Write an enzyme that holds these catalytic residues in place. Structure first.
Site, short mmCIF file in Angstrom:
data_model
loop_
_atom_site.label_atom_id
_atom_site.label_comp_id
_atom_site.label_asym_id
_atom_site.label_seq_id
_atom_site.Cartn_x
_atom_site.Cartn_y
_atom_site.Cartn_z
CG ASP A 224 -19.03 -9.61 4.75
OD1 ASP A 224 -20.21 -9.33 5.02
OD2 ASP A 224 -18.46 -10.62 5.20
NE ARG B 89 -20.97 -14.25 5.58
CZ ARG B 89 -19.70 -14.56 5.88
NH1 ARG B 89 -19.26 -15.80 5.78
NH2 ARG B 89 -18.86 -13.60 6.25
CG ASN B 90 -21.79 -11.83 1.94
OD1 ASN B 90 -20.92 -11.59 2.78
ND2 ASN B 90 -23.07 -11.93 2.26
CG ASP C 28 -21.91 -3.98 0.19
OD1 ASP C 28 -21.35 -4.36 1.24
OD2 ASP C 28 -22.20 -2.79 -0.03
C1 LIG Z 1 -26.58 -18.04 2.04
C2 LIG Z 1 -26.95 -16.59 2.29
C3 LIG Z 1 -28.45 -16.32 2.38
O1 LIG Z 1 -29.30 -17.21 2.45
N1 LIG Z 1 -28.70 -14.96 2.36
C4 LIG Z 1 -30.05 -14.37 2.43
C5 LIG Z 1 -30.72 -14.40 1.05
N2 LIG Z 1 -30.36 -13.12 0.46
C6 LIG Z 1 -30.73 -12.75 -0.82
N3 LIG Z 1 -31.47 -13.65 -1.53
C7 LIG Z 1 -31.87 -13.42 -2.83
N4 LIG Z 1 -32.67 -14.36 -3.51
C8 LIG Z 1 -33.21 -15.52 -3.03
C9 LIG Z 1 -32.89 -16.31 -1.94
N5 LIG Z 1 -33.79 -17.33 -1.93
C10 LIG Z 1 -33.87 -18.41 -0.99
N6 LIG Z 1 -34.68 -17.26 -2.94
C11 LIG Z 1 -34.32 -16.15 -3.60
O2 LIG Z 1 -34.97 -15.69 -4.71
C12 LIG Z 1 -36.10 -16.44 -5.16
C13 LIG Z 1 -31.48 -12.19 -3.41
N7 LIG Z 1 -31.70 -11.63 -4.65
C14 LIG Z 1 -31.09 -10.46 -4.60
N8 LIG Z 1 -30.50 -10.24 -3.38
C15 LIG Z 1 -29.77 -9.06 -2.99
C16 LIG Z 1 -30.73 -11.33 -2.61
N9 LIG Z 1 -30.33 -11.55 -1.32
C17 LIG Z 1 -29.57 -12.29 1.35
C18 LIG Z 1 -29.92 -12.88 2.71
F1 LIG Z 1 -31.14 -12.42 3.13
#
Ligand SMILES: *CCC(=O)N[C@@H]1CN(c2nc(Nc3cn(C)nc3OC)c3ncn(C)c3n2)C[C@H]1F
Length: 280
Positions: free
Chosen positions: A132, A136-137, A150
């Site tokens: 995947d 986005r990932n 992941d």
């Molecule tokens: C473009 C893909 C997307 O928006 N995926 C969302 C965000 N995810 C995710 N996000 C963060 N950090 C983060 C995102 N934003 C807007 N602010 C922050 O931090 C202040 C993140 N950190 C660790 N991991 C595993 C994250 N995942 C995954 C989807 F929910």
């Protein structure tokens, strides 16, 4: 790197970062009991298997220790499974390049390509097929440093397995290798195809691949030999790396180790390879 087992009292959710079919990810704070150290974290609450099965999968996941893979730090088992992971403060790379498109230079783009290839090479060493990979990932720790993450499609290959043979799960067609679309076959080399699409996303500042075209038509377009177009900022040298990632024969494609070398060379003289106004 080892797996910590957390009690609910050890961490707190602060705000939602995003949501999908996997569940919800929160920004949160983790304070290990009596350690007095406050650790910013991301908490992924997944939407049952035995607790020991889940812990075993989390142990392997927590052993994945590389600068360019987002690490599982701990887990809490209650009514739901909550995974405590490194927080990447700048969010997904897809949104990042879309937001900052007019302020991103060639050095950053090529460095990200190197880093993603390093993380994928590490996953291949661990016998993990990601299945995947997409912009986005990939997550942004700092503008200078990104990490692969992941959301449940990754698979560990057995000692004698050369490929993963998938079943009925929903598939991100526009990032998949032709053999994955046609035959549900996944390998490190199909991850290379996805890597190529991911690089295309970065070089187009987060544009949509096969934009406006039904997923159902993609296999037929690929079989006719058509591929994603050359991004405006790409010299042909960079585009040809992408095109190699999308060759029909999986063993024709570069391996991640090779991609690290090639993009690293380019990152040494970035303006020779990407053409960006005001850069610099
Ligand atoms: C473009 C893909 C997307 O928006 N995926 C969302 C965000 N995810 C995710 N996000 C963060 N950090 C983060 C995102 N934003 C807007 N602010 C922050 O931090 C202040 C993140 N950190 C660790 N991991 C595993 C994250 N995942 C995954 C989807 F929910």
């Amino acid at each position: 790197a080892l797996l910590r087992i957390l009690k609910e009292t050890e961490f707190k959710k602060i705000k939602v970062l995003g949501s999908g079919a996997f569940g919800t990810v929160y920004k949160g704070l983790w304070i290990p009991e009596g350690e007095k150290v406050k650790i910013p974290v991301a908490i992924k609450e997944l939407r049952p298997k035995a607790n020991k099965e889940i812990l075993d999968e989390a142990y392997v996941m927590a052993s994945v220790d590389n600068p360019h893979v987002c690490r599982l730090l701990g887990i809490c088992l209650t009514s739901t499974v909550q995974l405590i992971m490194q927080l990447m403060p700048f969010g997904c790379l897809l949104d990042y390049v879309r937001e900052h498109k007019d302020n991103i230079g060639s050095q950053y783009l090529l460095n990200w390509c190197v880093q993603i290839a390093k993380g994928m090479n590490y996953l291949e060493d661990r016998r993990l097929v990601h299945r995947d990979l997409a912009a986005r990932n990939v997550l942004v720790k700092t503008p200078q440093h990104v990490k692969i993450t992941d959301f449940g499609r990754a698979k560990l290959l057995g000692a004698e397995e050369k490929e993963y043979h998938a079943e009925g799960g929903k598939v991100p067609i526009k990032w998949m290798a032709l053999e994955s679309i046609l035959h549900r076959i996944y390998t490190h080399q199909s991850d290379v195809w996805s890597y190529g699409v991911t690089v295309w996303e970065l070089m187009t500042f987060g544009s949509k691949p096969y934009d406006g075209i039904p997923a159902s038509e993609i296999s037929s377009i690929l079989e006719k030999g058509e591929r994603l177009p050359q991004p405006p900022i790409c010299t042909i040298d960079v585009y040809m790396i992408m095109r190699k990632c999308w060759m029909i024969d999986a063993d024709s494609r570069p391996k991640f180790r090779e991609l690290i070398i090639e993009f690293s060379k380019m990152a040494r003289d970035p303006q020779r390879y990407l053409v960006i106004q005001g850069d610099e």
